[model samples]
Target: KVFERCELARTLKRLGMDGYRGISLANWMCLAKWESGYNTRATNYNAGDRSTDYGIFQINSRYWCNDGKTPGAVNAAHLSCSALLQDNIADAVACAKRVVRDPQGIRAWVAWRNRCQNRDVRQYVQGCGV
Candidate 1:
């Protein structure tokens, strides 16, 4: 819906998330495609407190706006449509970078996917590339 994917990629790169550097624009497109379907206003019903986390990456409002210092730190209300739309791409990239840094990059994502797998879902084993 928004035309800020290129800017988002740049921001992520600047933030030292280069593991995503070689990621094809189409791959990023696919990620946004699956994760919130490109909905900057998407919110997960099961994601903490049912808050309206905004942006192409679906970052939680509480994580950004909650009372604490954090990357792309923001006030509660600023997580709303106005502020979110104003700088959605940068915000999404910042949030994604933070996630990468916190658990030591996308390796955590691999662990998560593996942990979620069961016998029935064993066919879905996917590896993370560096």
Candidate 2:
């Protein structure tokens, strides 16, 4: 599903993404925007690393979800990479929360640092009633 910006922002907030592990909902919004453009079925395969980024958050198979292909990859999110591609975003949201529990927080996504960090990210949630 390709979610509308405000709809996704509101949904993330409802899912308690407003402040998970010190990462704001807007930051999550920024990540989602750059990662998958709010499309639940998005996938990006990294040929160099033999890994894939899956779903809205683009949760990676190299370290977070198990794809059974990437060497040294582990199911840190304890789910199949397929789970991240579902139209229902609950699983993706859960895994994203697990990702930030690491030391990198939102910086785990390079897109966030390049696009969201030190920027006016609050605009992502503006008028979303979040």
Winning candidate number (lDDT)? 2
Model 1 Cα displacement at 81 (Å)? 8.3
Write model 2 residue lDDT over 64-104, tens digit each, in one string: 89999888888988899999999889999999999889998
Q: Per-candidate TM vs. native?
A: 0.45, 0.96
Clashes of each: 0, 0
Global lDDT of each candidate? 0.46, 0.91
lDDT of 1 by residue, 1-130 (tens): 4545454445444555454533333344445544555566555533445455455655555555442423344553344333444444665565555554554443333422343322242122122221
RMSD of each: 8.3, 0.9
- Scored by lDDT, model 2 comes in at 0.91
